[PDB]
Design a protein around this ligand. Structure first.
Ligand SMILES: [Cl-]
Ligand SMILES: [Cl-]
Length: 162
């Protein structure tokens, strides 16, 4: 298991513009196109992202190229963020994958607001972090995904994903 296979389980793969759990236009492997209610705005964001006239459909290769860029972008966002980077550096390889999953889902700014959880993760207080991570809109809106990510931070294994 790795970050790619993890996010592929959590996000799915859809080759046509769809709305995500929040109602936002999305395509591929959780690639958010726009928060705007306009499907025309989505299509135009999609065209720009892929570099051709898509009419709201992309191929598998194209969904995987977006995925690759997005995983890369989430890593680079962790490493440039003063609050995330120290936590990430302190973690083992499995729990690093959990931190990436969270940033991919909710952005660097969102994860950086989990101030208390980040401190507990940094101190390696796993059971405590997991309890605090769960007291969140994140956990209440997407409980099954959030449980898998929280289990990863708690155990340091891929058990929630097998
Ligand atoms: Cl893009
Ligand atoms: Cl969920």
């Amino acid at each position: 298991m790795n970050i790619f296979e993890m996010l592929r389980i959590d996000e799915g793969l859809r080759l046509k513009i769809y709305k995500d759990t929040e109602g936002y236009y999305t395509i591929g492997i959780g690639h958010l196109l726009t928060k705007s209610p306009s499907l025309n705005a989505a299509k135009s964001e999609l065209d720009k992202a892929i570099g051709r006239n898509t009419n709201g459909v992309i191929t598998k290769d194209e969904a995987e190229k977006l995925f690759n860029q997005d995983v890369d972008a989430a890593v680079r966002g962790i490493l440039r963020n003063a609050k995330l980077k120290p936590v990430y550096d302190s973690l083992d390889a499995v729990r690093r994958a959990a931190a990436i999953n969270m940033v991919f889902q909710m952005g660097e700014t969102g994860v950086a607001g989990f101030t208390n959880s980040l401190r507990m993760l940094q101190q390696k207080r796993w059971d405590e972090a997991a309890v605090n991570l769960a007291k969140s809109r994140w956990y209440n809106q997407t409980p099954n995904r959030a449980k898998r990510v929280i289990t990863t931070f708690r155990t340091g294994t891929w058990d929630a994903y097998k």
